[PDB]
Subunit: 340 residues, 4 copies
């Protein structure tokens, strides 16, 4: 009658493997931990890596109370939906209209439709951490019954650049200026080589407005076959523009909803210099769930559940749990440039 | 014996799956509701979406008499045709000549011919809503015994662009001007990236007249195999021209007829910037039909009926009922440019 | 004894399924009527097409005495040959000479040779109607004891174009001029999109002579595998040149024999813009025939017969009867250009 | 004893399948006549077929006395070879001494080589008529006791062009002149389309010399299976390099000998614009052999014979009889111009 955590994990395989842009490109390692806290010493490498977690008071990061730690408990994300068979279901190919009126068949379809919405809600929380770690080397962590704190990965000052004092590309003459030298100087602050630049819509329009960029950029398709197939199913909000020399140009127009407001993952005039082989870690803390522990599921990135509430009245619901801790092993691998 | 709703839904699957261009590309999600009202709050992914429905008096939209809502009862389309045995059947290949004389074999094909003409009549209504929603973020909804109203889903003023005052492509130099800058500038108003542009015939003739487009457009077959597969059976009115950079170029020449007057879906000199992964919703209100309810068919996008009329038992008719409400989850995913 | 109509229909099925070019590509629907008269209102989707029939006197069309009609009785084509065992038989592969001495074997073989030639005579009449319907939107109908009339399908004047006043491709610079812009301008007159162009030999050589065409035309085999399959067995008079972007280029050098004189289907310097998904109808009036009525064959496109002339000194013959009426549902789907 | 007609046919099973190229490509219809005269009226599809026969004396054609005829007696050829002598054998590898002891095997091998040589010699007479039919539209045939005459099939003069002035490919500048426009202009004189051109080592080397030919040719095998099947049957080989757009480029290495001269099939290559679906007829006047009429062989393309005469031991011989008359239904389907 109730889907077990193992049954839901096997059904959500396709939706879980679908990763947003920044997670898919720069976070290619996953480390579920059997303990509630995440111990960075147990990850291969990263012997001296620490996380300076600072508590947030009054919406302002209070760094004086913060301290460096290699052990941390991530906040718990618990998207849940009540199971109502009378709710609308997305029509699937070759569905039987008479089955779609069976309340038992609609309950089966509602649970998996809820598993889709709950999965991408957790994937949004992971991508918010993913893009903020690349943009700033730090992000704000929230969670259920969790006081929001800032997780800092220790990015150098030189890796966060803002164009000012005449270096604004908007004030440069688009006809005769070549942004190559500026990008070369930005890329030197990166720990490794830079072979990809992720723009926002506005920053890309400014970047491509230069005549030297139009003449140099290879817009033809197949310029980077490895990257084009990695971003193929992300065409809704990701655009591969081409190769700018040995650097691949990508535009990220993704959005996330937070407190009922649509926000952009990338602020206006954003230019992120990075490496496709950068090391990002998807570490997950263990969520002690009685149903999961009884099924032998100790460490997992997702804890799907299909159960009823104990209180009266008994209402069936679905839920997926996760304790994500998206981290960059080397935050200086990226050079985040705020264009102006 | 009269054909039931479940049987006709089974035979119409081949014709019903044939979707017109805009419905097929941008409206890839169907949501039939179990109630007469369509509730936007139970559609996955929508966070407090509302429409503005204004009454239309004498062909004029009166927005002062309109109001916002998240629930709406769509107008019912009911294409009905009397089963006329005098209709000449299309001779099928390898068709047995003894079957041609059987009146039961003929009435089956005559009903299927009615089901075909009735399905494309509803598909024209849905495609009209779909095309007008992509062009203006709103459309006029009709229906059987239904006063016309304007269903507005809200498009920003910046996503509707008209070339004038020196920016019209017809007055540009076809040998030196590069429309690439205009497309990139127009694409900034989209919520996500742009990977497809749908032209009308005249807008395509103007766009490809530029020599910079002839040198850049990749017209080779297989340049965008996924899009070519989707528009393959639409060769009568849809033409895939190729890849213009990272953006595919499609020409839509579909047209409907009213009182013998041929009318195109897309106006003259129309350029629609959009995304192949854009989220359009095919919502349907439940049509409470006694025959459908008895067969356990509650929610459906089509309600085919084969019944006899009440005035004269000698008259037998067929009918397909539907309550379409084509909506765009984000009308700003598209940028409708009126070329000049 | 005498071969029945059903036996003759089964033997001639392969020869009947073999269609000339314009019938095979543009007239993919057949509608045999059980009544001697063809009723346009009984055909699905012919609300927007009207027939204007004018009489012909001294080979000159008189439109002033012509009028519209929704009902039509086509002329009767009745190719007949007498069966004489003196005819020389085509030596088939693996044929047995012991059968050649059998009088019944030679009788069957000669009847089949007559059925082949008689089918070609009717297929020529249909292709004549098909070619002229595509070229002009009208054709001249003949028949036994049938006064010739012009069947006009009401093509717009904009869809018949003649190059004149500097527009002639022959007066253009073959080294620098691009005929693409002219073709795109011509295609704007079509109801839908244009994905096929049918040239005559002379008009193709003029279109081939431009250097911009030699660089743009993809002549590789397999460029349009579905169209190459359709014209594979027509290699005598049909040549597939390749894909001109998204438009297939076909050359038609077919000839029809009228009054013992071979005549080309297409006039010199002919360029026909069209669509492979265009709706062409092969309507056939009923022919009351005793041998066809014996098998319950009321409506048919062919009426084969093997009978002996009663009242005359022992004359055995064969005959196939037909009342063809080829129609274009929308003659504006084609743009017929008379090059110069 | 003497070998049955079926016994030599089982030996000439695969040997009669092999056929010279021009007969294999353009003469797929065999019409063996039961009368000594051939009657072109008794062949289906021939629209008033006539042959202009002219008597030839002292090596010159007198067309003043000739007249168009529909009937014609083909000259009969009967190559014969004596059987069962002690003549020096033919060298064939992988032959053991076990077959040197049986005198019947050597006699058996003598019949096969004679049947092959006689079947070849008649096949050469037909190819002389065939090659000359598509090259000149007229030919002179020989006979056992026949009076030589010219057989003119009415080839149009326009299909027999002669290069003069600047049309010579040697006078034209190499790599500055495209042979396409010549081949397309010469093809306008053909009745249908041209999908094959025949070459030879001398003229194909001139055609492959142009740089523009190298890129447009498809050297990969599998382009035309029927064409590659003909190149494989010949051990000494007769090859074609591949497709040339829609036209096939074939090279013929076969040669013949007429009387005492070793005149070639065609000088250099000229231009052989042909169609693989062109209609050519293999018309055979019947040869009256008493043993053939006794076996029921009234009309046949080949009259094979294995009989014995007189002597002690009696003289044995083999003979294949045929009265071939190779004709082109439409000689204007080919264009032959003198090329240098």
């Amino acid at each position: 009658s109730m889907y077990t955590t193992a049954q839901l994990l096997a059904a959500n395989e396709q939706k879980f493997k679908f990763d947003p842009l920044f997670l898919r490109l720069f976070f290619r390692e996953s480390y579920p931990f059997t303990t509630e806290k995440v111990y960075l010493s147990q990850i291969p490498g990263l012997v001296n890596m620490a996380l300076y977690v600072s508590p947030i008071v009054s919406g302002e990061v209070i760094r004086s109370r913060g301290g460096s730690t290699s052990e941390f408990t991530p906040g718990y994300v618990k998207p849940k939906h009540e199971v109502n068979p009378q709710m609308t279901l997305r029509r699937l190919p070759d569905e039987d209209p008479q089955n779609l009126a069976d309340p038992a068949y609609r309950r089966r379809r509602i649970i998996m439709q809820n598993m889709r919405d709950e999965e991408l809600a957790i994937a949004q929380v992971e991508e918010m951490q993913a893009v903020s770690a690349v943009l700033k080397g730090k992000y704000t962590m929230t969670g259920e019954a969790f006081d929001p704190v800032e997780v800092d990965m220790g990015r150098s000052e030189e890796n966060n650049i803002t164009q000012s004092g005449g270096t604004e590309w908007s004030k440069r003459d688009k006809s005769t200026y070549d942004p190559t030298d500026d990008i070369e100087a930005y890329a030197l602050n990166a720990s490794g080589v830079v072979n990809i630049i992720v723009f926002d819509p506005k920053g890309w329009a400014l970047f491509r407005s230069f005549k030297a960029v139009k003449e140099k950029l290879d817009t033809r398709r197949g310029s980077n076959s490895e990257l084009e197939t990695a971003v193929k199913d992300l065409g809704k909000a990701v655009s591969y523009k081409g190769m700018y020399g040995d650097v691949a140009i990508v535009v990220y127009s993704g959005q996330y909803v937070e407190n009922g407001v649509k926000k952009n993952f990338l602020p206006d005039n954003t230019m992120v210099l990075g490496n496709t082989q950068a090391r990002g870690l998807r570490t997950y803390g263990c969520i002690q769930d009685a149903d999961a522990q009884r099924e032998g599921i100790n460490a997992s990135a997702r804890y799907p559940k299909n159960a009823v509430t104990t209180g009266d009245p008994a209402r069936e619901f679905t839920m997926i749990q996760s304790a994500p801790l998206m981290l960059l092993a080397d935050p200086d691998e990226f050079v985040s440039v705020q264009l102006a």
